[PDB]
Amino acid sequence: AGAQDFVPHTADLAELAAAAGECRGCGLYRDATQAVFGAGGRSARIMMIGEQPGDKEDLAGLPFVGPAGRLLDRALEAADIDRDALYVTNAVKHFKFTRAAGGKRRISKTPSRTEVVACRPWLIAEMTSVEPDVVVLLGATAAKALLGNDFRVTQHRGEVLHVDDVPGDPALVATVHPSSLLRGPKEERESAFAGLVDDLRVAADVR
Ligand code: SF4
């Protein structure tokens, strides 16, 4: 049952976000600072979904505000997509984390499939509210949330996907999460960035 009873009977994003602040649909609300709902408006043609709010997002109250979000901004701009026209969110809405002694940040921990499924009523509410033409799935957790737990992002780069149990039948494009592009050898980071731009352009060219 997960988050389902916490989701109000409205498509209004402000009302949904306020209700998500009270969600206890899995255990992640306990240690997180606050729920981080998606950001953007219901006229958005492109929805983008990451894994979870990270350390910076958990305190900003907004998605994609840390280093991964700044890299995503650079890729969006290169793809000539206006971020203000997107609806951006995450598969789960509370930050799951630990700390290491001497660390500079809280370290994100992978949501279990159980947590993803518990939080999915919020994602369905967002998709029903926004009616996107295309959904960009950033990373394995988000892609699996809609495409199935066995789905491999690495095996379907550049492909427009469609699955029948997604409400509205939007196009789906699964790509690497921007956090994966922050570190590594220079030429591999550069090739990976170009690939993210490519996938964003595929999504933007839908219809
Ligand atoms: S992660 Fe999702 S289901 Fe879990 S408590 Fe937070 S909003 Fe609710």
DSSP string over 92-136: SSS--EE--TT-SSPEE-PPPHHHHHHHHHHHHHHHHHH--SEEE
Instruction: Report the C-alpha dihedral over residues 6, 129, 179, 146, rounded to 10 degrees.
Output: 80
Please state the φ and ψ torsions of residue 149, each to the nearest 5 degrees. -65, -20
Q: Whose CA is nearest to atom 2 of ligand 1?
A: 119
Residue 53 · residue 63 · CB < 8 Å: yes
**Resolution of the structure in the document, Å:** 1.6
Residue with tokens 């500079």: 104
3-state secondary structure of 64: coil
Query: How many Cβ atoms from other residues are within 10 Å of residue 127's Cβ?
Result: 20
How far separated are the first and last CA of the chain, in Å rounded? 35
Residue 13 · residue 41 · CB < 8 Å: yes
Alpha carbon distance 71, 186 (integer Å): 14
Alpha carbon distance 28, 144 (integer Å): 19
Pocket test for ligand 1, best of 30, 51, 94 (most atoms within 8 A of CB): 94
CA of 79 to the centre of ligand 1 (A): 32
Query: How many Cβ atoms from other residues are within 10 Å of residue 75's Cβ?
Result: 21
Alpha carbon distance 199, 196 (integer Å): 5
Q: Which of 144, 38, 55, 139 is nearest to 95 (CA)?
A: 55
Alpha carbon distance 36, 133 (integer Å): 23
Question: Measuring from each residue's beta carbon to the nearest atom of ligand 1, which residues come in under 6 Å?
Answer: 2-3, 20, 23-26, 28-29, 35, 92-94, 118-119, 122
Residue 144 · residue 177 · CB < 8 Å: no
How was this structure determined? It was done by: X-ray
Residue 54 · residue 94 · CB < 8 Å: no
Residue 48 · residue 170 · CB < 8 Å: no
Question: Any known ligand binding at 177?
Answer: no
Strands 46-50 and 134-138, sheet pairing: parallel
3-state secondary structure of 142: helix
CA of 112 to the centre of ligand 1 (A): 12
Query: How big is the CA angle at 67 (ends 156 and 199), to the nearest 5 degrees?
Result: 25
Q: Which tokens in the block code for residue 175?
A: 């790509």
Q: Which atom of ligand 1 is nearest to the CA of 2?
A: 3
H-assigned helices in the chain: 13-20, 55-60, 67-78, 113-130, 140-147, 186-204
Q: Which tokens in the block code for residue 194?
A: 């170009």
Query: How many Cβ atoms from other residues are within 10 Å of residue 47's Cβ?
Result: 26
Q: Which atom of ligand 1 is nearest to the CA of 26?
A: 4
Alpha carbon distance 71, 142 (integer Å): 18
CA of 12 to the centre of ligand 1 (A): 18
3-state secondary structure of 86: strand
Alpha carbon distance 90, 63 (integer Å): 8
> Which residues pair with residue 164 across a beta bridge?
none
Domains of the chain plus CATH, in order, are 1-207 (3.40.470.10)
Residue 135 · residue 146 · CB < 8 Å: yes
Q: Give the DSSP H or E segment for 89.
A: strand 86-90
